[model samples]
Target: KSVVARVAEAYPEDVGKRIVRMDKYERAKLGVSVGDYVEVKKVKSVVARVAEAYPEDVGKRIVRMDKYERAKLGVSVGDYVEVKKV
Candidate 1:
């Protein structure tokens, strides 16, 4: 299963770590938990570890990706992307 979410820039501390931060609700719907590997899809795809989104981002259908991850997916902040268990 997959969910579509708006992309947000990863937090400074998360950059270059191949981590994708998602709201807990979203993670639950995807049957994932923090530290689980997930597949992020745009036109291309990348494998990344899941992390809980910041408090401010909870309840929003947002996913945070680092610059390297965005580059791999050919996405930018505010764009929609698909996420699913790997």
Candidate 2:
């Protein structure tokens, strides 16, 4: 129930929200759908609701989250992190 993917900055509107955007294909691998919760981890873990990433990012193994979320997970854009269904 877990996958590793690179991080990216979330859409402007998503800032401050505990949301993580992944491709539908990736979500499928995690057995998750939109609105489902997932645990994003680096040294620690942060719970975030799943959403679909941008069309251009689809199939690219990229996960998007706001800066706050990146901070919580101790990850930055281009860093890989583990995501698992909760």
Candidate 3:
């Protein structure tokens, strides 16, 4: 199964091009947790671990990525990405 989510910047402390954040429903629906991998479909598809997000974007179906990760995807700030279990 797959779902669409907007991609944004991940937290500054994120170590590398490996982390992405998702909303509650998106996480549950895909049966993923903070350390699980999911496919991110940007201009190019890549694998990223799932992280949970809330309150700030509690009810939104969105994902966050840091600069290096975004560079991997060749995506801009406001692009939506397709996510799926690998």
lDDT, candidate 2, 1-86, per-residue tens? 89998999899999998999999999999999999999999999999999988899999998998899898878889999999999
Error of 2 at 40 (Å): 0.2
After superposition, the stretches of candidate 3 with alpha carbons farther than 4 Å from their true spots are 15-17
What TM-score, over all chains together, does every model reach? 0.96, 0.96, 0.87
Best by the lDDT measure = 2
Candidate 3 lDDT, 1-86, residue by residue in tens: 78898887677777585878888789888878778899998668888888778469767787887777778788877888899988
Model 2, C-alpha of 79: deviation from truth (Å)? 0.5
Candidate 2 local Cα displacement, residue 29, angstroms:
0.5
Off by over 4 Å in 2: none
- Tens digits of per-residue lDDT, candidate 1, 1-86, equal 79999999889988889898898899988999999999999999999999988899999999999889999889999999999998
Q: Candidate 2 — which pairs collide?
A: none
lDDT of 3: 0.82
Which scores greater on TM-score, model 2 or model 3? 2
Relative to the true structure, how large is the alpha-carbon lDDT of every model?
Answer: 0.91, 0.92, 0.82
